[PDB]
């Protein structure tokens, strides 16, 4: 079962935020990173924050070395196929996490999924392929590979889709800004309502302005 860090709401629990860490991190590591960036913990009045940890597994860009990665990648580029087999395994594990939140009494339309780097890619696969009834999706410094299963699923979709909140730093040398912009343009052309925030002088990192406007957007999607 997934290990996790739970940041409670201040009052009665009525919504949930599943926040997925980037490659090589952990749920507690991301929570602590956000705490450092904001100079205090990210908390809400009625939204519970769930920071699960990717189980350690082989990671091909690390030459098969073990890392806390949600899924595998052949190479760091958007120009190669995505590794669907590892993505689908993690989609099932994270569906069990969403189902335990629903079982606890939270409607799927009161759950927001998102992440940083790999976590954002994982959140997009979850929301647009299996859980189109979530309140929304957010991706921080993330991208989808060309010919993604997300695009094929959206091509075959007809309903209302979860809104995407996407942020990227223009100077990011790990996830190129062009890969994140292409992903956002692709999703928009496929019928997804999106907000794309481009941060100049921001690299592959979390910024205080980015987290402040993300918090404001989460509150519009999960009102008290
Ligand atoms: C984020 O989690 N990342 C892992 C998948 C590829 C994009 C990004 C990354 C790129 C290069 C080096 C480390 C992380």
From Swiss-Prot:
Domain of life of the source: Eukaryota
Residue ranges that the Swiss-Prot or TrEMBL entry lists as coiled coil: none
Active-site residues per Swiss-Prot or TrEMBL entry: 117 (charge relay system), 172 (charge relay system), 204 (charge relay system)
Catalytic reactions of this protein: S-hexadecanoyl-L-cysteinyl-[protein] + H2O = L-cysteinyl-[protein] + hexadecanoate + H(+)
Cross-referenced InterPro entries: AB_hydrolase_fold, LYPA1-2/EST-like, PLipase/COase/thioEstase
Keywords assigned by UniProt, alphabetized: Acetylation, Cytoplasm, Hydrolase
Family per similarity comment: Belongs to the AB hydrolase superfamily. AB hydrolase 2 family.
Designated name of the protein: Lysophospholipase-like protein 1
């Amino acid at each position: 079962v997934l290990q996790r860090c739970i940041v409670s709401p201040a009052g009665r629990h009525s919504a949930s935020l599943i926040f997925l860490h980037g490659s090589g991190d952990s749920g507690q590591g991301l929570r602590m990173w956000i705490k450092q960036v904001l100079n205090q913990d990210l908390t809400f009045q009625h939204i519970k924050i769930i920071y699960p940890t990717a189980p350690p597994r082989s990671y091909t860009p690390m030459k098969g070395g073990i890392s806390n990665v949600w899924f595998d990648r052949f190479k760091i580029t958007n120009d190669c196929p995505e590794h669907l087999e590892s993505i689908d395994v993690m989609c099932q594990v994270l569906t069990d996490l969403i189902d335990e939140e629903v079982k606890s009494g939270i409607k799927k339309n009161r759950i927001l999924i998102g992440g940083f780097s790999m976590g954002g890619c994982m959140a997009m696969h979850l929301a647009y392929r299996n859980h189109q009834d979530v309140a929304g999706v957010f991706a921080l410094s993330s991208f989808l590979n060309k010919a993604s299963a997300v695009y094929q699923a959206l091509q075959k979709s007809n309903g209302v889709l979860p809104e995407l909140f996407q942020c990227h730093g223009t100077a990011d040398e790990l996830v190129l800004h062009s890969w994140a912009e292409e992903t956002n343009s692709m999703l928009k052309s496929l019928g997804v309502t999106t907000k794309f925030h481009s941060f100049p002088n921001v690299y592959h990192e979390l910024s205080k302005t980015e987290l402040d406007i993300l918090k404001l957007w989460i509150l519009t999607k999960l009102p008290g």
